Amino acid sequence: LHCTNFNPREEIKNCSFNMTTELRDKKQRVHSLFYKLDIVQINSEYRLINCNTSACTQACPKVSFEPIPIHYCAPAGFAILKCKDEEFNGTGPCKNVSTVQCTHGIKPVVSTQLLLNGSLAKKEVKIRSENITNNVKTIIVQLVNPVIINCTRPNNNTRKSIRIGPGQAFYATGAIIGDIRQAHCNVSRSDWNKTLQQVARQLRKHFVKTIIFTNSSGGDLEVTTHSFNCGGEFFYCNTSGLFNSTWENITLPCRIKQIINMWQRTGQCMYAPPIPGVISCVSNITGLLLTRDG
Amino acid sequence: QVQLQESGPGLVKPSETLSLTCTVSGGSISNYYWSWIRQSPGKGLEWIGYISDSESTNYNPSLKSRVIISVDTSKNQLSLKLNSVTAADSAIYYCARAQQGKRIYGMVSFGEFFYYYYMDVWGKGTTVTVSSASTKGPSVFPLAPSGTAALGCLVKDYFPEPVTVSWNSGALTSGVHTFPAVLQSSGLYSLSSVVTVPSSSLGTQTYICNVNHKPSNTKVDKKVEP
Amino acid sequence: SYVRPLSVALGETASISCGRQALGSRAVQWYQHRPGQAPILLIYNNQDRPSGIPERFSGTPDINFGTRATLTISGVEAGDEADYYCHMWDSRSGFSWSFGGATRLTVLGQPKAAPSVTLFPPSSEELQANKATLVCLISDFYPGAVTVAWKADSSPVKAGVETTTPSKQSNNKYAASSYLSLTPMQWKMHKSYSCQVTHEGSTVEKTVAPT
Ligand SMILES: *[C@@H]1O[C@H](CO)[C@@H](O[C@@H]2O[C@H](CO)[C@@H](O[C@@H]3O[C@H](CO[C@H]4O[C@H](CO[C@H]5O[C@H](CO)[C@@H](O)[C@H](O)[C@@H]5O[C@H]5O[C@H](CO)[C@@H](O)[C@H](O)[C@@H]5O)[C@@H](O)[C@H](O[C@H]5O[C@H](CO)[C@@H](O)[C@H](O)[C@@H]5O)[C@@H]4O)[C@@H](O)[C@H](O[C@H]4O[C@H](CO)[C@@H](O)[C@H](O)[C@@H]4O[C@H]4O[C@H](CO)[C@@H](O)[C@H](O)[C@@H]4O[C@H]4O[C@H](CO)[C@@H](O)[C@H](O)[C@@H]4O)[C@@H]3O)[C@H](O)[C@H]2NC(C)=O)[C@H](O)[C@H]1NC(C)=O
Ligand SMILES: *[C@@H]1O[C@H](CO)[C@@H](O[C@@H]2O[C@H](CO)[C@@H](O[C@@H]3O[C@H](CO)[C@@H](O)[C@H](O)[C@H]3NC(C)=O)[C@H](O)[C@H]2NC(C)=O)[C@H](O)[C@H]1NC(C)=O
Ligand SMILES: *[C@@H]1O[C@H](CO)[C@@H](O[C@@H]2O[C@H](CO)[C@@H](O[C@@H]3O[C@H](CO)[C@@H](O)[C@H](O)[C@@H]3O)[C@H](O)[C@H]2NC(C)=O)[C@H](O)[C@H]1NC(C)=O
Ligand SMILES: *[C@@H]1O[C@H](CO)[C@@H](O[C@@H]2O[C@H](CO)[C@@H](O[C@@H]3O[C@H](CO)[C@@H](O)[C@H](O)[C@@H]3O)[C@H](O)[C@H]2NC(C)=O)[C@H](O)[C@H]1NC(C)=O
Ligand SMILES: *[C@@H]1O[C@H](CO)[C@@H](O[C@@H]2O[C@H](CO)[C@@H](O)[C@H](O)[C@H]2NC(C)=O)[C@H](O)[C@H]1NC(C)=O
Ligand SMILES: *[C@@H]1O[C@H](CO)[C@@H](O[C@@H]2O[C@H](CO)[C@@H](O)[C@H](O)[C@H]2NC(C)=O)[C@H](O)[C@H]1NC(C)=O
Ligand SMILES: *[C@@H]1O[C@H](CO)[C@@H](O[C@@H]2O[C@H](CO)[C@@H](O)[C@H](O)[C@H]2NC(C)=O)[C@H](O)[C@H]1NC(C)=O
Ligand SMILES: *[C@@H]1O[C@H](CO)[C@@H](O[C@@H]2O[C@H](CO)[C@@H](O)[C@H](O)[C@H]2NC(C)=O)[C@H](O)[C@H]1NC(C)=O
Ligand SMILES: *[C@@H]1O[C@H](CO)[C@@H](O[C@@H]2O[C@H](CO)[C@@H](O)[C@H](O)[C@H]2NC(C)=O)[C@H](O)[C@H]1NC(C)=O
Numbered sequence: 001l002h003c004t005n006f007n008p009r010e011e012i013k014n015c016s017f018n019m020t021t022e023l024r025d026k027k028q029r030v031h032s033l034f035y036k037l038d039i040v041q042i043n044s045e046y047r048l049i050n051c052n053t054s055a056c057t058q059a060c061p062k063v064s065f066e067p068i069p070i071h072y073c074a075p076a077g078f079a080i081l082k083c084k085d086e087e088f089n090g091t092g093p094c095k096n097v098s099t100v101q102c103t104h105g106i107k108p109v110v111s112t113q114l115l116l117n118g119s120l121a122k123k124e125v126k127i128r129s130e131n132i133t134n135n136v137k138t139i140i141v142q143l144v145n146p147v148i149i150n151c152t153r154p155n156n157n158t159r160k161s162i163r164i165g166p167g168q169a170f171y172a173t174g175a176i177i178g179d180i181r182q183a184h185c186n187v188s189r190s191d192w193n194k195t196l197q198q199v200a201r202q203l204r205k206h207f208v209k210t211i212i213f214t215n216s217s218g219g220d221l222e223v224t225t226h227s228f229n230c231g232g233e234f235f236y237c238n239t240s241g242l243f244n245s246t247w248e249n250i251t252l253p254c255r256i257k258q259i260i261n262m263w264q265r266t267g268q269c270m271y272a273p274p275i276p277g278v279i280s281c282v283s284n285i286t287g288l289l290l291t292r293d294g
Numbered sequence: 295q296v297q298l299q300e301s302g303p304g305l306v307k308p309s310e311t312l313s314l315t316c317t318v319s320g321g322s323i324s325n326y327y328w329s330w331i332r333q334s335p336g337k338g339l340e341w342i343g344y345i346s347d348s349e350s351t352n353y354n355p356s357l358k359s360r361v362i363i364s365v366d367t368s369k370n371q372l373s374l375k376l377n378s379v380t381a382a383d384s385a386i387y388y389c390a391r392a393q394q395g396k397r398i399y400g401m402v403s404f405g406e407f408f409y410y411y412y413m414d415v416w417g418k419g420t421t422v423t424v425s426s427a428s429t430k431g432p433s434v435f436p437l438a439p440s441g442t443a444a445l446g447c448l449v450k451d452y453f454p455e456p457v458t459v460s461w462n463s464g465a466l467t468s469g470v471h472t473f474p475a476v477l478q479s480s481g482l483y484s485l486s487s488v489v490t491v492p493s494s495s496l497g498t499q500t501y502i503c504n505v506n507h508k509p510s511n512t513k514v515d516k517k518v519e520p
Numbered sequence: 521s522y523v524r525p526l527s528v529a530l531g532e533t534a535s536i537s538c539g540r541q542a543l544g545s546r547a548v549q550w551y552q553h554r555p556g557q558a559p560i561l562l563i564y565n566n567q568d569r570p571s572g573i574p575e576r577f578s579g580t581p582d583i584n585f586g587t588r589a590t591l592t593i594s595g596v597e598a599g600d601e602a603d604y605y606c607h608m609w610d611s612r613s614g615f616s617w618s619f620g621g622a623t624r625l626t627v628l629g630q631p632k633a634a635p636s637v638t639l640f641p642p643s644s645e646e647l648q649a650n651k652a653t654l655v656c657l658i659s660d661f662y663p664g665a666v667t668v669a670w671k672a673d674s675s676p677v678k679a680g681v682e683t684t685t686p687s688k689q690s691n692n693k694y695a696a697s698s699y700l701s702l703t704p705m706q707w708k709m710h711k712s713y714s715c716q717v718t719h720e721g722s723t724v725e726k727t728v729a730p731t
C-alpha cells in the first residue's frame with residue numbers, strides 16, 4: 001500500500017495500490033480508505049496488519065450480524081432444569097426449580113466489559129462468580145435496571161466496489177461525504193452513577209472496605225475496550241470515563257476497525273466492509289464483568 | 295461607532311520597504327482583529343494578513359516572507375510593512391476589522407469546530423504606486439465659464455494618483471463633477487473638475503477650487519472668472 | 521483572477537451561485553465590492569446580515585449538508601451592479617485565504633440617458649505658457665459607451681487626443697473626459713474646433729472658437 005494522511009483519535013488513510021482485475025494479465029491502480037488501526041507501516045509504504053500472520057475473508061455483504069434469539073432445546077429423553085429463585089447466586093441449591101424443554105430466547109450479543117442487550121435482575125443487582133476470594137476468577141454483574149447506551153458513527157461513508165477477479169468484488173471504503181467527525185457512544189450520567197452505586201453496595205457485601213473503579217490493564221485493543229457491533233461496523237470504545245469512581249452525558253471515544261479476529265483464533269480474520277451512510281444503534285447495558293487485583 | 299482611515303506614501307520606489315498606517319476611531323485597538331486587503335487592477339481582492347487582539351501575526355502564504363503587521367496600542371494605530379516591493383505590489387490597500395467566528399459542527403470537546411473570520415468595517419483605502427519614476431506636482435489652470443453655466447479647472451500633468459478637488463474649500467458641493475484622470479504617453483495623469491452653477495452669480499460670488507496632491511506635497515488653489 | 525459575468529433584469533431577483541462548493545459544514549461570507557471602492561459586507565454567517573444591509577440580501581443557511589451557498593438579491597436595482605465575493609470557509613478545507621473569483625452582476629434594462637457635452641477653450645494662463653489644451657466633458661449618459669471625434673474646422677483631427685474610458689458616477693450613470701492638445705499657434709489659426717460625441721445611434725456636437 002502507498003498511503004497518505006487525511007485532511008488539513010481516529011486516523012484515516014487514503015491508500016493507492018496495484019490490484020488485479022477480471023483478467024489475469026491486466027492490473028488496476030485503485031485507491032481506498034483504511035483506518036489506521038487496520039494497517040501498519042513497513043519503513044510512506046504501509047501494509048495490511050493481517051498479511052503477515054493469516055489471510056482474511058471479507059463478509060458477504062448480504063448477511064447480517066443481527067443477534068436474534070436462539071432457543072437451545074434438549075433431545076427427547078433428556079430435560080433442562082430452570083432455576084426460578086430470584087436471588088439465585090448462580091451456584092448452589094435452588095428452591096424454585098422447574099423443568100423445560102428449551103431455554104428462552106438467548107441473543108448471541110458479542111461485547112466486552114459491558115454486556116449489551118440482556119436479561120435483567122428481577123430485584124437487587126445480583127453478582128456471580130466462582131471463588132470470590134480468587135481474583136483470577138471473572139466476576140459477572142447483572143444489573144436490575146438497564147442504563148441505555150447511545151452509539152453512532154457520524155461520518156457519511158460511501159461504498160466503492162472494486163473487482164479483484166472474475167466474480168470477486170472487494171468493497172473498498174470510498175469517500176467521506178460531508179463532515180469528518182468522531183465515532184463515539186453516549187450513556188447517561190446520574191444513571192450510570194445511579195447504577196454504579198448499586199453495583200458498589202453489592203460488591204462490599206462480599207468484601208466487608210472501600211472499593212475503587214479504574215480502567216483496563218493494557219495490551220490488545222479488543223481486551224482493553226468496549227468492543228461490540230453497531231449497524232455492521234465493529235466499534236472499540238474507551239471506557240476509562242465509565243469506571244472512574246471510588247466508593248449531561250458521559251461520552252466514550254470509539255475507534256472503528258475493519259480487520260477483526262473476533263474469536264481470538266489461530267490466524268483467521270474478517271474484513272468488515274464499509275457500511276454506506278450513517279450508523280447509529282441504541283443498546284441496553286444490562287450486565288458487567290469486572291476483574292479484581294488483590 | 296467605529297471608523298477607519300488608511301495612510302500611505304502614494305509612491306514607493308521598487309525594491310524598498312512600503313509602510314502604511316491606519317487610525318481607529320471610537321474603539322479600542324487591542325480589542326478586535328485587524329486585517330489588510332489590497333486590490334490591484336486586473337486582480338481580485340487579495341487578503342494580505344491579519345493581527346489578533348492578542349497581537350499575534352498570521353500572513354497569507356502569498357507574501358508571508360515579506361509582510362510584518364505591527365500595532366501601536368498607545369493610540370489606535372495599526373501598522374503594515376512590505377519588504378522588497380515590485381511593480382505588481384501597487385494596489386489600493388485597505389484595513390478592516392476582522393471579527394472571529396466559531397462554527398461548531400460536531401462536539402466542541404472532540405475539536406469538531408473551525409475558526410472563520412469576517413471583516414465588517416473597512417477603511418476608505420490608500421493608493422500606492424510602484425514605479426521608479428519621480429513625483430511631480432500638478433499645474434491647475436482655470437476654465438472660465440460662459441439657464442446655467444459650467445466652469446472648472448484643468449489639473450494638468452501630475453504623477454502619481456491621486457488628486458483631490460474641492461470648490462470654495464468645501465462650501466460649494468452641489469453640482470460638482472470631478473472627472474477621472476487620463477494617463478498620457480508622457481507618463482503622468484491629468485484631471486479636470488467642473489461645477490454647474492446658476493448664471494446669476496457670474497461676477498459676485500467668487501468660485502475657488504482647492505487641489506491637493508500629497509505624493510508631492512504640492513497644495514494649490516485657483517479662482518475662476520470670465 | 522478570472523471573472524464570472526452575470527446579468528439580471530431590473531426589478532428581478534438575482535441568484536448568485538458561490539464559487540467553490542463546501543466539502544463539509546460551512547461558514548460563508550458575502551462581500552459587495554466595487555472597483556475603486558471600499559468593499560461592504562452583505563452576509564457574514566451563512567445567512568446573518570449585519571446592521572444597515574437591506575433584507576433583499578439573503579443567503580442560504582447550512583441546516584443540512586448538501587445545500588449549496590447562494591446570494592439572493594431580490595428586486596435588483598441599478599446600484600446592485602458590482603463585484604460579489606464568496607468567502608468560503610468549511611470544516612474540511614484549509615485556511616480560506618482567498619476571497620475566490622468575483623461575479624460581476626450587471627443589472628440590465630436600465631433606462632437610457634443622453635450625454636451632457638461641454639467643451640472649454642484653452643485658458644488665458646495656459647495659452648500664456650505656450651501650451652493649449654481643449655477639454656470636452658461628457659457626462660450623465662447610459663449605457664457607458666461613447667465615441668469622440670475632434671473637428672479642426674472642416675477636416676477632423678485625432679493626433680493629440682487622450683480620452684478617458686467611461687466611469688460610473690454616483691447617479692449610476694457614466695462619464696468620460698476628452699482632451700485635445702495642440703500648440704497655441706494652431707489654436708489661433710483655425711476658425712473653430714468641435715467635439716462630436718456619438719452615443720448610441722445619435723451624435724451631438726459642442727464647438728468652440730478662438731475669440
Ligand atoms: C452525544 O453526546 C454529544 C456530546 O454531549 C452530543 O454532541 C452534540 O452534537 C450536536 C449535534 O450533533 C452539537 O450541536 C451543534 O452545536 C453547535 C453549537 O451550538 C451552540 O452554539 C450556538 C451558537 O452559539 C453562538 O451564538 C449564539 C447566538 O447565535 C450565542 O448566544 C452564543 O453565546 C455563541 O456566540 C458567542 O460565542 C462564540 C464562541 O465563543 C463567539 O464566537 C461569538 O462571537 C459569541 O461571542 C447556539 O445557537 C446553540 O443554541 C442552540 O441550542 C440550544 C440548546 O443549547 C437551543 O435551545 C437553541 O434553540 C439553539 O437551537 C448552542 O448553544 C451548533 O452551531 C450546531 O448547529 C449548526 O451546525 C449543524 C452542523 O454543522 C447544522 O446542520 C445546523 O443547522 C446548525 O447550523 C446553523 O447554525 C450555523 C452557525 O450558527 C449557521 O451557519 C447555519 O446556517 C445554521 O443556521 C440556521 O439554523 C439556526 C438554528 O439551527 C438558526 O438560528 C439560523 O438563523 C439559521 O436559520 C449543532 O447544533 C453539539 O454541540 C454537541 N455537543 C457538544 C457538547 O459539543 C451528541 O448530540 C450526543 N448524541 C449523539 C451523538 O447521538
Ligand atoms: C446526551 O445524549 C443523548 C442521546 O441519548 C442526546 O440526545 C437526546 O436524547 C434525549 C433522550 O432520549 C432525547 O429526548 C427524548 O425525546 C423523545 C422524543 O419525544 C422522548 O420520547 C424522550 O422522553 C426524550 N427523553 C428525554 C430524557 O427528554 C433528545 O431528543 C435527544 N436530543 C435530540 C437533539 O434529539 C443528548 O442531546 C445528549 N446531551 C448532551 C448535552 O450532549
Ligand atoms: C440516541 O441519540 C439520538 C441522537 O442524539 C436520538 O435521536 C434523536 O431522536 C429524537 C426523537 O424525537 C429526534 O427529535 C425529533 O427529530 C425530528 C426530525 O429532526 C423533529 O421533527 C422532531 O421535532 C424532534 O426534534 C432527534 O432528531 C434525533 N436526533 C438525531 C441526531 O437523530 C435518539 O433518540 C437516542 N436514542 C435513545 C436515547 O434511546
Ligand atoms: C441491541 O438491540 C437493539 C434493538 O434490538 C439493536 O438496535 C437495532 O440495530 C439494528 C442494526 O444494527 C437495526 O436494524 C436494521 O437497521 C438497518 C439500517 O437501517 C436496516 O437496513 C435493517 O432493515 C434493520 O432495520 C434495528 O432497527 C435496531 N433496533 C432498534 C429498536 O432501533 C442494537 O444494535 C443491539 N445492540 C447490539 C450490540 O447488538
Ligand atoms: C505479524 O505482525 C505483528 C505486528 O508487527 C507482529 O507482532 C509484532 O512482533 C514484533 C516482533 O519483532 C514486535 O516488535 C511488535 O511490537 C509486534 N507488534 C504488536 C502490535 O504486538 C507479529 O509477531 C507478526 N507475526 C508473525 C508470525 O511474525
Ligand atoms: C431495554 O430495556 C427496556 C426497559 O427494561 C425494555 O423495555 C421494556 O420491554 C418490556 C418487554 O416488552 C416491557 O414489558 C417493558 O414495559 C419495557 N419497559 C419500558 C420502560 O418501556 C426494552 O425492551 C429493552 N430493549 C432491549 C433491546 O433489550
Ligand atoms: C450521504 O451522502 C450521500 C451522497 O454521497 C447522500 O446521498 C444523497 O441523498 C439525497 C437525499 O435527499 C438524494 O436525493 C441523492 O440522490 C443522494 N445522492 C446519491 C449520489 O445517491 C446521502 O443523503 C448522505 N447521507 C445523509 C444522511 O445525508
Ligand atoms: C485519494 O487520493 C486519490 C489520488 O490518487 C484521489 O483521487 C483524485 O481525486 C481528485 C478529485 O476528484 C481527482 O481530480 C483526481 O483525478 C483523482 N486522482 C486519481 C488518480 O484518481 C481520491 O479522491 C482520494 N480519496 C479521497 C477520499 O479523498
Ligand atoms: C481513554 O481515554 C482516557 C481519557 O478519557 C485516556 O486517558 C489518558 O491516558 C494517558 C496515557 O496514560 C494519560 O497520560 C492521560 O493523563 C490520560 N488522560 C486523562 C485520564 O484525562 C486514555 O489514554 C484512553 N485510552 C485509550 C486506550 O484510548
Ligand SMILES: *[C@@H]1O[C@H](CO)[C@@H](O)[C@H](O)[C@H]1NC(C)=O
Pocket residue numbers: 002016017018029
Ligand atoms: C504498480 O506496479 C508498477 C510496476 O509494475 C510500479 O511502478 C507502480 O508504482 C505500481 N503502482 C502502485 C503500487 O500503485
Ligand SMILES: *[C@@H]1O[C@H](CO)[C@@H](O)[C@H](O)[C@H]1NC(C)=O
Pocket residue numbers: 089090091092093128129130131132
Ligand atoms: C452463592 O450462594 C450460595 C448460597 O446457596 C453459596 O453457597 C455460595 O457459596 C455462593 N457463592 C458465591 C461465589 O457467592
Ligand SMILES: *[C@@H]1O[C@H](CO)[C@@H](O)[C@H](O)[C@H]1NC(C)=O
Pocket residue numbers: 084095096
Ligand atoms: C416460585 O416462583 C413462582 C413464580 O411466580 C412464585 O409464584 C412462587 O411463590 C415461588 N415459590 C417459592 C417457594 O419461592
Ligand SMILES: *[C@@H]1O[C@H](CO)[C@@H](O)[C@H](O)[C@H]1NC(C)=O
Pocket residue numbers: 240241242244
Ligand atoms: C476520572 O475522574 C477524575 C475526577 O473526577 C477526572 O479528573 C478524570 O478526568 C476522570 N477520567 C476520565 C478518563 O474520565
